[PDB]
Amino acid sequence: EFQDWPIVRIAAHLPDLIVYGHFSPERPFMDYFDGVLMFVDISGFTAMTEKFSSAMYMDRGAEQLVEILNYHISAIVEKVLIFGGDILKFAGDALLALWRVERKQLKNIITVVIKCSLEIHGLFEIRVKIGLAAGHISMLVFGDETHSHFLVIGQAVDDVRLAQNMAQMNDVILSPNCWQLCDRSMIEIESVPDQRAVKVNFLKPPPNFNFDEFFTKCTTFMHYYPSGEHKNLLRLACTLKPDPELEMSLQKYVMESILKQIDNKQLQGYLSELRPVTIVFVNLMFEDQDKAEEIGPAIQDAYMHITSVLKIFQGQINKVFMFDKGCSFLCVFGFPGEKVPDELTHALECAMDIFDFCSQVHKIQTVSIGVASGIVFCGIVGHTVRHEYTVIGQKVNLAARMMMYYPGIVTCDSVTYNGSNLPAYFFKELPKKVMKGVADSGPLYQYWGRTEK
Numbered sequence: 001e002f003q004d005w006p007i008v009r010i011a012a013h014l015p016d017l018i019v020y021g022h023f024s025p026e027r028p029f030m031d032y033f034d035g036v037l038m039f040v041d042i043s044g045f046t047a048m049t050e051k052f053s054s055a056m057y058m059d060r061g062a063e064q065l066v067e068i069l070n071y072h073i074s075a076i077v078e079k080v081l082i083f084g085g086d087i088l089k090f091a092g093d094a095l096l097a098l099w100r101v102e103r104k105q106l107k108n109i110i111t112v113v114i115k116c117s118l119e120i121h122g123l124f125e126i127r128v129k130i131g132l133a134a135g136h137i138s139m140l141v142f143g144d145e146t147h148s149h150f151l152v153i154g155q156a157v158d159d160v161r162l163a164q165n166m167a168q169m170n171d172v173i174l175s176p177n178c179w180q181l182c183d184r185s186m187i188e189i190e191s192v193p194d195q196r197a198v199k200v201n202f203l204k205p206p207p208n209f210n211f212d213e214f215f216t217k218c219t220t221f222m223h224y225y226p227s228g229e230h231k232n233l234l235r236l237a238c239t240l241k242p243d244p245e246l247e248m249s250l251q252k253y254v255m256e257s258i259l260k261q262i263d264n265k266q267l268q269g270y271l272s273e274l275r276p277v278t279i280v281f282v283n284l285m286f287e288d289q290d291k292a293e294e295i296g297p298a299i300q301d302a303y304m305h306i307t308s309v310l311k312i313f314q315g316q317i318n319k320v321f322m323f324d325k326g327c328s329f330l331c332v333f334g335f336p337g338e339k340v341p342d343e344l345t346h347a348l349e350c351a352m353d354i355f356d357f358c359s360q361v362h363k364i365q366t367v368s369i370g371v372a373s374g375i376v377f378c379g380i381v382g383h384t385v386r387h388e389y390t391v392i393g394q395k396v397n398l399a400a401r402m403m404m405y406y407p408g409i410v411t412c413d414s415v416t417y418n419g420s421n422l423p424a425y426f427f428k429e430l431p432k433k434v435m436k437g438v439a440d441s442g443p444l445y446q447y448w449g450r451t452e453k
């Protein structure tokens with residue numbers, strides 16, 4: 001069976017949630033379902049990226065880094081996939097997976113997903129941290145006529161965020177609702193101080209229990225688990241055949257430079273690089289009460305403005321995420337074929353413009369934007385059959401921490417400040433705060449703009 005069609009290469013960049021969806025053209029588009037979520041945090045992906053920028057790697061640092069990264073990440077991905085999970089998104093520091101099932105099956109699937117989590121830790125004995133949640137999930141699709149983005153939002157998402165930030169290395173933490181829904185007969189746990197979540201210590205199945213048979217019966221409930229003559233494929237998406245309307249929808253989710261590689265119009269290694277870029281990390285905050293029905297339209301309206309300004313200032317959205325009631329856009333200036341000599345001025349002017357517009361979007365409570373510039377790793381991270389263009393580096397992390405620790409304003413780092421072709425009074429030096437995992441930032445600045453108010 002031939003399976004290397006463009007439509008299949010595109011599907012590698014996308015989860016089944018999207019590949020096998022049937023969304024209306026309305027934007028935003030929202031659907032609702034139940035599932036189990038797994039969030040995997042890898043530690044070290046910070047440490048080593050800065051190591052691979054060393055002269056030791058003789059200008060092959062990016063190539064060496066993506067190689068060892070994909071070696072470790074693709075092992076996690078195939079464990080997720082063989083246990084029937086759908087990898088939703090990659091960040092440089094993590095991936096989020098989903099088991100979507102009917103509510104009656106959540107209890108059994110949690111057991112599957114806990115075994116899956118234990119075998120992932122078994123790969124590394126470099127380490128990982130895992131948080132699990134279960135419950136209601138809302139999916140949000142937003143975009144315009146040529147670009148689409150998705151998010152998951154809701155109960156189980158907020159819960160998986162809770163569980164993930166308590167975990168330490170080698171932990172598997174269960175959401176309070178996952179603990180309440182799971183088969184406590186079979187899972188041995190320990191309480192975590194000052195918390196209602198639990199840590200999983202052991203999986204203790206009854207004497208009769210056979211996990212392989214158990215798993216096989218659970219695949220009964222997985223619509224897209226490969227079986228029969230496709231039982232040794234990692235994804236059913238590998239079997240997709242050419243279908244112009246489906247490819248038309250799917251390609252809207254993928255950045256243009258990726259599509260050019262998919263079409264064999266660019267060397268397949270062109271996108272692995274340590275490159276100077278400016279990161280513009282945009283956070284849109286909503287109130288705790290807000291429902292997904294109201295968040296979706298706000299994000300759509302914000303997005304319609306973000307995308308138009310990015311095009312003017314030649315930036316791109318690399319990743320969208322949401323947690324802690326905040327939707328964040330990882331924007332990048334100076335991507336593989338998009339470097340300009342006034343890049344820094346443009347990143348700030350684009351930030352300020354995004355700030356001013358989104359701050360007048362109804363239901364958005366706070367806009368916060370961090371700007372940082374420097375060498376970041378760029379590349380396609382994951383497994384052959386499931387992977388995504390991602391940016392990694394201290395500057396990515398610094399921009400993200402700035403928008404968190406300095407809410408409601410536009411901040412920038414010292415590189416962006418000194419290297420902008422703007423006068424100093426457009427800026428304000430800021431009190432330097434201690435920030436998680438950020439070792440002396442340098443001086444930071446608020447981008448005040450051209451006039452006092």
Ligand SMILES: COC(=O)c1ccccc1Cc1cn(C)nc1-c1cc(Cl)nc(N)n1
Nearest residue numbers: 089090091094095096151152161321322323
């Ligand atoms: C540090 O905490 C987290 O990153 C985090 C923790 C818990 C939930 C979500 C995120 C954000 C996140 C990371 N990844 C790799 N993917 C996402 C993501 C993907 C999708 Cl489809 N929808 C939403 N809402 N988030």
